[PDB]
């Protein structure tokens, strides 16, 4: 409050840079978060015509995780336009080809199907690994919590935690195991 | 293999195994008994 008109408007309608870490995250949940931010539906001043979308930088998109057998079952379909140009590629093959395609397509499908969609997609920055360009890193403002909490492995559990968990059963001594 | 909607063991050595998503009747003694679901 007490700002001048132009600075106040600039602050209100400024676009913020968010960071998502895609490691072990479902591309769909990443895409939901990113699509909300790209549309600007996270802002109370939101309106379809106010162009109030924000920048989303998703890193480690190479390390996304699909639930179920989606890596093998989910099929991405495209057509080159030419006869016989129908191409159907499983998620695993598409991921091996382009380590950004799966998250990009998820976000593209979640965004509203209008002319603003590609302007929004211009504000989406996908990076396969931990590396991010220096200018993007300097732009970053906030990091969004990962939608899925990564379960711990036994190798990661501490011996104290293992001990704290009770033993469930008495194994017979005379067993090879 | 022979494609069958219902798999039936024929001799004693015909064994059912679910491989690559579907059931098979394999048989060492009588490979004629090979069946695929």
């Amino acid at each position: 409050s007490s700002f001048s008109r132009a600075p106040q408007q600039w602050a209100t309608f400024a676009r913020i840079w968010y960071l998502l870490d895609g490691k072990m995250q479902p591309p769909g949940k990443l895409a939901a978060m990113a699509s909300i931010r790209l549309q600007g539906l996270h802002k109370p001043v939101y309106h379809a015509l106010s162009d109030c979308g924000d920048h989303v930088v998703i890193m480690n998109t190479r390390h996304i995780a699909f639930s179920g057998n989606k890596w093998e079952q989910k099929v991405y379909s495209s057509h080159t336009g030419y006869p016989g140009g129908f191409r159907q590629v499983t998620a695993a093959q598409l991921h091996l080809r382009d380590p950004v395609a799966i998250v990009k397509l998820a976000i593209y499908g979640m965004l509203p199907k209008n002319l603003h969609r590609r302007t929004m997609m211009e504000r989406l920055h996908l990076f396969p690994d931990e590396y991010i360009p220096e200018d993007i890193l300097k732009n970053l403002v906030e990091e969004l919590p990962q939608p899925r909490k990564i379960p711990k492995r036994l190798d990661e559990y501490t011996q104290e935690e293992i001990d704290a968990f009770p033993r469930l059963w008495t194994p017979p001594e005379d067993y090879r195991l | 293999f022979k494609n069958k909607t219902v798999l039936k063991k024929r001799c004693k050595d015909c064994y059912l195994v679910k491989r690559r998503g579907r059931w098979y009747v394999y048989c060492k003694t009588h490979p004629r008994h090979k069946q695929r679901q």
Binding site: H55, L115, R118, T119, E122, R123 | -
Partner: protein, 71 residues
């Protein structure tokens, strides 16, 4: 950072929400051709090319030059 309190009769809710200042420790010191043009502008402003192309006289004359102003 809000304090909620019903009044004694329980008919009005009182919310105390003072504005919290940013700690000094949470701050940093102040540091001390058409095709290519449209590509450059699109890259600069993270938009698509379509925004930057001109519009016909019909659209330009349709635009309102004295729009109402509020506040």
């Amino acid at each position: 950072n809000v304090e909620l309190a019903l009044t004694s009769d329980g008919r009005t809710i009182v919310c105390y929400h003072p504005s919290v200042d940013i700690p000094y420790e949470h701050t940093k010191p102040i540091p001390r051709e058409e095709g290519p043009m449209i590509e450059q502008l699109s890259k600069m402003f993270f938009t698509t090319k379509h925004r930057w192309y001109p519009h016909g006289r019909y659209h330009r004359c349709r635009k309102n030059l004295n729009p109402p102003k509020d506040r």
